[PDB]
RNA sequence: CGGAACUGAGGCCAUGAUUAAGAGGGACGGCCGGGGGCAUUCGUAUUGCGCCGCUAGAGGUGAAAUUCUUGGACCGGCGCA
């Protein structure tokens, strides 16, 4: 974990692959290429409440407690890819998704391009659900 | 000289055929359209597999457990199905 770049003039990026789903929060630090991990760490190893892993205070706690860690390796700067569960499922992000995105606001890592990723299909397969739906 | 069938060539008849339906059928001209059938091409995602990387949880709920998981899960990359 050390860039041998000179800090300013030019940044030695990794690249943050940020999931917040509606149950979970995974960061996965990676090179420029993405095949080589570099540290990745989830909120349930750091929280253990089933109920609020998810939760927007457990999700932004989490997202400042790992890019706190990232930032203690010593990686200046991050391309982003934020990503959601996606597919036939559900295109927003969970309640951990904006409390972790406010908490990394604060974080302090720099940033390089940032994109979004989240896997959308042409045409879907049939979602986990009855024709009659999650009724309640 | 009268009355039935058959058979030749005339003269004349203003010589003979109602219109073409804001009824209909059929033809023609270039179009029009997720119209039909057959064959052909493409896309991602998907779930599964194989391989590589770090790793201890992952799942899922209003809240939990059976469930998968240090015989390497989930996450990420490349190929295949």
Same mark, same amino acid.
């Given at each position: 974990s050390?860039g041998?770049?000179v800090?300013?003039g030019?940044?030695?990026?990794?690249?943050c692959?940020?999931?917040?789903?509606?149950?979970?929060?995974?960061?996965?630090?990676?090179?420029?290429?993405?095949?080589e991990?570099?540290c990745?760490?989830?909120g349930?190893m750091?929280?253990?409440?089933?109920?609020?892993?998810?939760?927007?205070?457990?999700?932004?706690l989490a997202?400042?407690d790992?890019?706190?860690?990232?930032?203690?390796?010593?990686?200046?700067a991050?391309?982003?890819?934020?990503?959601?569960? =996606?597919?036939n499922?559900?295109?927003?992000? =969970?309640?951990?998704?904006?409390?972790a995105?406010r908490?990394?606001?604060?974080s302090?890592m720099?940033?390089?391009?940032?994109?979004?990723?989240?896997?959308?299909?042409?045409?879907?397969?049939?979602?986990?659900?009855?024709?009659?739906?999650?009724?309640?």
């Open positions: 050390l041998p770049q800090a300013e030019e940044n030695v990026f990794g690249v692959h940020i999931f917040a789903s509606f149950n979970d929060t995974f960061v996965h630090v990676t090179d420029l290429s993405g095949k991990t570099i990745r760490v989830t349930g750091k929280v253990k409440a089933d109920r609020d892993e998810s939760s927007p205070y457990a999700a932004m997202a400042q790992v890019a706190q860690r990232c930032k203690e390796l010593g990686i200046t991050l391309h982003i890819k934020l990503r959601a569960t =996606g597919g499922r559900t295109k927003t992000p =969970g309640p951990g998704a904006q409390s995105l908490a990394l606001a604060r302090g720099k940033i390089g391009r940032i994109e979004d990723v989240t896997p959308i299909p042409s045409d879907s397969t049939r979602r986990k659900g009855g024709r009659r739906g999650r009724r309640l």
